[PDB]
């Protein structure tokens, strides 16, 4: 059938790159134009791209076998031999990391708990700090299935071990650039988002991470190309791709006011025509509708044109 | 268009009553047959039932205007004036609570954080204990927009009143029965799951909560009727209802070998024909296929035939 979209407002959706609600919808021409996000990526033909999972609960998480060692130059670490989050074997393949693995940089606080398999399993929990970044550490290679972290909080002298699940808690020194996935070697990646026509800019769905700085915590924005419900929608459908892009309208739910027309490119990112210097936010209580298949060179009206 | 389901394995899905992956798929005739779950409830016509939200991130969470008051020999007491989790006004209506509010009982550990509205907002995080009730001394009223939690404190914690979001962390004394929604008074509820034909039992999607005691923590099962991906699927579609149920087959994804046939009743729960007395677990790497619309009286094949 013709491609269509759920008639769900962004403010009711789940974020696709940090596991929290969508709070914001914006364009910002001052930001990197062609981010190389690995989560929140789907093709309109139904193919999840990069490390994108179908479940929001997998976003910025990982599963592993946990053990401990002294690391040369660093000190006491935990090593994590990664597993897919459903417990299935991780095999290095056509994506940078296990499904849902973090696709940004910074020092991530993770909470690591014993795997839950049945009622009565005894659970330990330990908190760690994991450096995602331009690391050159042979122990940090999520593509090959191994990462490491430092212990930062422990309930007891009996730390978590064996099969575990890691969830994100907070970020320090956040940078929205891909981590080092394969210890400075080439790694399979979803390509950068783009290209855009002249005057076209990426539509961003925004949430907030808890960013710590020793004493005081602050909100830090993180964007994604589509909410997780739109990711799972395309993955659950097998739409026929009839052209390069879909023309959409975003309308106020209550009044029907057109807020903007936009293009959903086949590779799963939305473009608006906007040439301001700084951020333009939109109401999150609007609806998307599919108008038509259109060519890549289809010229959009500028936001607020009459 | 004919009803179809996403071709997603249970083990790749999100749980609809506790915000975690689905780990298990089972029937268990020892458990309560007709539970009154309020989350994870959707009609095949696309209507969210009970308190069920679209987003898995809303499950067992709430949002509120918080007021904190210190009480000698308790600590900080939070009065939360609930809002919907999108920041919209909560109005007592045709469901027991704001969307996604917990639908089980026990003492819930919640992590409460300052509302996040823009980069640079200063955030404070505090962990509270919330008795979901019913207890002879519980006066929770989420239906009216008013709930309470407390944190043990020798002195004031200098908490700041304002808008917050609360997420679940652990449970103590879990019981799978509805919480105190309205100060011991009646409240609109999604009806119990059912009814079932003779020999039919509920199919359960299982995850595990962290359940704490004084010095220990252990996994505790919680079941839901559908994964959150099926909830959001039905709510996103507007299928034309043609009969009373959908005949499904649960199949090995590779081989296509049938594990069982089942009925998805229009009111959003799946039945199998199973008369064992013990729990019967299923592999979580199968998929559900819609076969056809069938009436309420359609007799399923017994699991194993």
């Amino acid at each position, epitope marked *: 059938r013709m491609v269509d979209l759920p008639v769900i407002q962004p403010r009711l959706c789940t974020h696709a790159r940090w596991p929290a609600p969508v709070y914001g919808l914006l364009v910002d021409p001052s930001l990197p134009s062609n981010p190389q996000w690995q989560n929140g990526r789907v093709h309109v033909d139904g*193919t999840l791209l990069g490390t994108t999972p179908i479940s929001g609960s997998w976003v910025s998480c990982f599963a592993a076998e946990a053990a401990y060692k002294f690391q040369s130059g660093t000190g006491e670490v935990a090593t994590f031999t990664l597993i897919e989050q459903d417990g299935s074997a991780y095999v290095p393949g056509d994506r940078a990391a296990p499904l849902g693995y973090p696709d940004f940089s910074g020092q991530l606080e993770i909470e690591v708990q014993t795997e839950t398999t049945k009622t009565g399993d005894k659970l330990k929990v330990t908190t760690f700090e994991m450096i995602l970044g331009p690391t050159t550490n042979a122990d940090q290679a999520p593509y090959q299935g191994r990462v490491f972290a430092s212990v930062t909080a422990a309930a007891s002298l009996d730390l978590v071990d064996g099969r575990v699940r890691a969830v994100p808690r907070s970020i320090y020194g956040f940078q929205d650039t891909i981590p080092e996935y394969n210890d400075g070697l080439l790694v399979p990646l979803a390509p950068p988002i783009g290209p855009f026509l002249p005057g076209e800019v990426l539509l961003r769905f925004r949430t907030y991470m808890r960013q710590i700085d020793t004493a005081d915590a602050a909100a830090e924005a993180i964007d994604c190309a589509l909410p997780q419900e739109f990711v799972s929608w395309f*993955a659950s459908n097998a739409f026929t791709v009839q052209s390069e892009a879909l023309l959409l309208r975003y309308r106020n739910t209550l009044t029907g006011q057109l807020l903007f027309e936009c293009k959903l490119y086949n590779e799963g990112y939305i473009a608006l025509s906007y040439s301001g210097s700084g951020p333009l936010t939109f109401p999150t209580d609007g609806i998307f509708e599919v108008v038509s298949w259109v060519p890549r060179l289809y010229q959009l009206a500028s936001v607020g044109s009459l | 268009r004919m009803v179809d389901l996403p071709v997603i394995q249970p083990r790749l899905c999100t749980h609809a009553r506790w915000p975690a992956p689905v780990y298990g798929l089972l029937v268990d005739p020892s458990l309560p047959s007709n539970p009154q779950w309020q989350n994870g409830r959707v009609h095949v016509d696309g209507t969210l039932l009970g308190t069920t939200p679209i987003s898995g991130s809303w499950v067992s969470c709430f949002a509120a205007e918080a007021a904190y008051k210190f009480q000698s020999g308790t600590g900080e007491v939070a009065t939360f004036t609930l809002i919907e989790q999108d920041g919209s006004a909560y109005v007592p209506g045709d469901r027991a609570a704001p969307l996604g509010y917990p639908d089980f009982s026990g003492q819930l550990e919640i992590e409460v954080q300052t509302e996040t509205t823009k980069t640079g907002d200063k955030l404070k995080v505090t962990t509270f204990e919330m008795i979901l009730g019913p207890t002879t001394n519980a006066d929770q009223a989420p239906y009216q927009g008013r709930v309470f939690a407390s944190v043990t404190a020798a002195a004031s914690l200098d908490l700041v009143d304002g808008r917050v979001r609360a997420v679940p962390r652990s449970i103590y004394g879990f019981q799978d029965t509805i919480p105190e929604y309205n100060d011991g008074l009646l409240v609109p509820l999604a009806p119990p799951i059912g009814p079932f034909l003779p020999g039919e039992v509920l199919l359960r999607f299982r995850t595990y909560m962290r359940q704490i005691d004084t010095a220990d923590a252990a996994a505790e099962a919680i079941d839901c009727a559908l994964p959150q991906e099926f909830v959001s699927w039905f709510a996103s579609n507007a299928f034309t209802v043609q009969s009373e149920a959908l005949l499904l087959r649960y199949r090995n994804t590779l081989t296509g070998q049938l594990l069982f046939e089942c009925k998805l009743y229009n009111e959003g729960y799946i039945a199998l024909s199973y008369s064992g007395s013990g729990p019967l677990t299923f592999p979580t790497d199968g998929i559900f296929e819609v076969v056809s619309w069938v009436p309420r009286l359609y007799q399923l094949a017994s699991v194993g035939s």
Partner: nanobody
Amino acid sequence: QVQLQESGGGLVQAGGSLRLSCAASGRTFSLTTMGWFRQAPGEDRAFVTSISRAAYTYYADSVKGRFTISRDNAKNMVSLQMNSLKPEDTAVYVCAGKGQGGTWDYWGQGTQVTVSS
């Protein structure tokens, strides 16, 4: 649900070439990406190559510039042209497919490739 049937394979001398193909049948709208893994005795499957519905390809470093994958969407069929075969390419080659959850869900029966010296 989705069956994968391989063709091709067998014995070749080092420096030679073989073509493998794979055809999918059953409920193929649940089959997204198709690819090839290979396995030596006592070892796990290792990724060789994949190709998406949009014909986007990935290759293991060890086979880059020697192996080429192609796909026919209408026939749910892929081909792997393997040139400049090396001893270390000796393995059982297995056609694979992802389902809608982005996991590798479907396996062929496997075909022995032996690169003799």
